[PDB]
Design a protein around this ligand. Sequence first.
Ligand code: AGS
Ligand code: MG
Lengths: 217, 441, 341, 111, 132, 49
Amino acid sequence: SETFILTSIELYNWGGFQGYHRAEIDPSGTAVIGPTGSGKTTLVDALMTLLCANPRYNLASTGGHESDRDLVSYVRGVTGPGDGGVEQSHIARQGKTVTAIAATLERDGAQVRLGAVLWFEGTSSSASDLKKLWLLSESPEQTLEHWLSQHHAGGMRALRQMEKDGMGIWPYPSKKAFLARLRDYFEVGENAFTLLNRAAGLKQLNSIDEIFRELVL
Amino acid sequence: AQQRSERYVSARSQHPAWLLLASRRAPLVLGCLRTLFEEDALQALSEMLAAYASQATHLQAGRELREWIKRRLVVEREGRIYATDALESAIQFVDSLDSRIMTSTASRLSVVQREIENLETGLNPSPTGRIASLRRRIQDLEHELARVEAGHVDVLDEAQAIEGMREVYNLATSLRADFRRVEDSWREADRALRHSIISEHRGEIVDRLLDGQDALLNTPEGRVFESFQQQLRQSAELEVMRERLRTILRHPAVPKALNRPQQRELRWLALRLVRESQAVLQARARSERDVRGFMKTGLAAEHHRVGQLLNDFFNLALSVDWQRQSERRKPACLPPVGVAITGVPAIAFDGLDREALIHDTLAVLVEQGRPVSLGELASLLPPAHDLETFALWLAMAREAGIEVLTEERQFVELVDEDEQRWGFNLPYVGLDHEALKDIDW
Amino acid sequence: AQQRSERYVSARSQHPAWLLLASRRAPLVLGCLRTLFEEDALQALSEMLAAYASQATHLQAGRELREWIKRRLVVEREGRIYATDALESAIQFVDSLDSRIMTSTASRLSVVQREIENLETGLNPSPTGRIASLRRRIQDLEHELARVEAGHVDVLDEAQAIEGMREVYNLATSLRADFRRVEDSWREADRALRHSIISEHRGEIVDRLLDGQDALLNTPEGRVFESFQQQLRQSAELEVMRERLRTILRHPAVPKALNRPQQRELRWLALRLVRESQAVLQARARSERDVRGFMKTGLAAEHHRVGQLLNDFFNLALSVDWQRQSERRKPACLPPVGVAI
Amino acid sequence: RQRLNLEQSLLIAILRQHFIAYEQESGTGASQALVAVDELIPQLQVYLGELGSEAKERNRIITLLDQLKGHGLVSALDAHDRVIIRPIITHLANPENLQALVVWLREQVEG
Amino acid sequence: RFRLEFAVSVIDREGNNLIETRTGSQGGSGGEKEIIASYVLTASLSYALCPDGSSRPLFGTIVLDQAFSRSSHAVAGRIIAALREFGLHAVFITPNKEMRLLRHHTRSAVVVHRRGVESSLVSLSWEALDEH
Amino acid sequence: LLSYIDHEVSMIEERLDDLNSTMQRVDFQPGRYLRLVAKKVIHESLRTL
Ligand SMILES: Nc1ncnc2c1ncn2[C@@H]1O[C@H](COP(=O)(O)OP(=O)(O)OP(O)(O)=S)[C@@H](O)[C@H]1O
Ligand SMILES: [Mg+2]
């Protein structure tokens, strides 16, 4: 009808997954299954990072009492608390690297794509050294591989130059303007997405007054 | 005068809504149709018709639906049933017999006088009379301002406020009556266009229409709707109107005039109207796209010729004797099409299901019709998993209120897939169908 | 949900207009009724039914007429027949199936917005808002006057003019909607009052009501109609409105907007409205006079006793054998009244 | 496969007319031609005739539908008493074959 | 917004009777907390979307993690029924604890796998999976 | 202090009514459903002011 719904999800060089991966989701409601500790929560965390203004990674594990991870660990791809030694073998990728994610919403006679690109430059772990960029496309010819080709063929300016000659593209250097534009486009309340992220894994209710006075109103 | 009688006879003969009025089962049909608009329709119609024997079910419901579709009361596009103007007109007529908001009010007279004055002023092209009218209106407004500054703020009465609210609601809600009419006009125009194209097949017309990017399906209703929506696109006055309405709603006299649904409808006029207006553009676009796709097929001449040949064959088919088996079994001449091969060249999932077990146990209980203990029930219906079943039976017994005795033991011997033996020291229960016949699960 | 189903079943069972529509001979009878309201009626019905056998005329026409009288679609008072709301509703529904004036037009939207503003202003008791709105409206009118004096006179287009004219006709013709409803409400109030008096027959209530000069038979529709006619009695605005209507009547777009009957209807709006409004008060006065006459008759107790005695007699009459001639010829006990010598 | 007689030929012609009706008012999108048996019953009764009981006519129609399904023109009935007309009939009732069969039947009637 | 106090109440369908008033989710059992929290959160989310200012939602989807970790079958059935009645679209994430109900109420499945430190994602309908 | 606060409270009450209007459609345990209510309290330093 006139309601957008998620249709597919991309992933590239993110967390445990390496190389190029993608999954399709039927709009009639789908299930995700796998043995214990196989990456199920990773996919949803990657999806959630793109919407809320403050992610709560791996919330459902504790039932809603604590957070346990951060963006940098996902980006570099740690796979355990580690052993301790000269070579930190418990880290998948070191040095300069690139990560890119994308999501696709579809509606009858419509199609909208989101996504982001992040990268480092040298062997470092400071939060400030995280080069970030968010995107929002409308045309169908915009694909993740095109973005990667543009990045490898140039730099930040090369990526920004797409808007000058292309159409249906609006890069944002700051997440705040991106969120404002998204909310204006979708015509939703100011606290909808954070509410969704909070409702993803919460299993208790201490007092409804906090929920209404902080989220709903 | 007699022409009116002839037209009435024709209307009684033709118009589908009147035929639905003349239908015997009109109440149930109207109730079902009104409830739905707020395949599966056949299910709902049969379910409603079920507990109304009084006075087949599935067959009759299907026959009625197909007859109404042939009567064009509703339309079928791909897999969905859509309504026309006649349904809404009939529904309005039926539900208007209860309560109608009176129009012969002094407030309506005042509004009519104001609109008449506005029309008379607007249609005048004289540059002098307009200036004089503007001066007179400004003078009257200044007089009113002076009187108000004198301290003469006028507040209307309770009955006056109620009448004003009712008239405003009546006039406002009437904006949504013409929506289905535009869709029906577009569909009939499309059907006429397709009939003309197939009747003509000439490829020059198809090429010219495909080349032309001008909008097809031109009816006056489309232009009127376009103008209405174009003026509706200006939100500046819409915000003021919404604010005024919400200000009005907070008055003590509101509960005395309008019920809950009317207030709810009035609160969200603007956004609902905007969305409803948007909803028709997609339909127009899809209709145009389908027409263009059909035109690009280029099979109109083929269909015309095949229809002519089929008509000739069916004309010939009336001169044969279908009462003879020998003639009916006389082979014809048609080459085999799509001939297949000659058959051969001549050389930890699943777990447990609850519903099936419950239904089978209910069937056994009703067919036996006597109290049964666990041993006999296990013997008659051997289980796949020994557990997950005793617990279910005990839970049913406890929930139904049927007493269970624990002072005596019944020994049941079971053998699993891999041979071996197990012994269950169950207590005694007695199960009957009558006690548990009226509890959902 | 199911409540609406039950309500519609009851409506099919009850509403006389639906019964007339569900009749076999609905079209011809409806045409005859429309012709008449525009003995004698029964004769005309037989005349029309004569040359329409297709598909004893006097025998069946009277039966249908009397059934519909029982169905109350037509009211018979002394010897004359009058129409009610249901017949007019059915007539409107039938004639609306051919042409319906479009209602989703921009002009109606403008009227709705302006009337919303007017009512919101009129229901505000605060003086400061009134002053501010007055000044703002004066300023807007002054700006528009300045633009017009600058030479910006605007005239509606032919399509827009036709739209406006059709909307004006649609709104104007709505004034004659609920005339008969007041009459029907007064009739049912009369019946209810008579039944209450008979069920009571207490002479104190009748004497008090006769002594009291307060007008009885009061309905909310009566109050609304009274206020409407009180405002209507101001001829100053009526003359101006009629002059504007006459001025508009002479325009090139008139033939392309309305037909001859619509022009005729718009031509004599005021006189016909005054006539119909005056007709209601005479009927109400007759109803009140007849109510007072029936009350002054003072036979309610006698009629109640006679009704009770007839009920008892009819209850007892079900225990005899009516199949025997001898019992049917057994003389009764009744003294002669008005014997002829 | 076996040859085709006149009763099956008339049924195929009726199904071709149904397919034409379906194809005329069709646009972009995946759709199928489904026809109920009860709709087909009176049209074939017009030519063949009418049997005493509805059961007899229904059995005859089911037999004919099974005979035509053996040629791959239709499919099995669903739970709602409907059949699906395969597009292969379009090539079975192409105008050349239609003309040939019309001429042959005309010669059969005339003498 | 700090000058008000909020409470929830359970009212019987027929008639209008207070049956239980609550200010939170204290003192409950395992399943009760889960069902109450899910119900109130999904209702609040449904309101918080476009129908806040009326009209139908433009972005309808909701993600549940570790679905039905503590409840029984009937509670899960009620949850699914309510979620569908609210008129949204759901994606479920569960271990292999339960799959019958998912098969009964879904159409597509994604299987993830790990072999070493990599990962593999496969998507499929149920009909293809049934044949293995 | 008077106008802004009172108007905000009134708007909040109206919005809460709108929210609890639609809750009734969805069904809780059979024969039951939920409803949200609010009460007004005034306290703290306001009186002092
Ligand atoms: N921040 C992190 N630090 C270390 N290891 C991590 C981190 N994030 C994820 N992992 C690894 O990624 C895996 C956990 O991710 P997931 O497989 O999504 O967990 P999971 O899917 O919730 O497991 P289940 O099935 O829900 S119990 C483990 O192998 C962890 O060692
Ligand atoms: Mg977690």
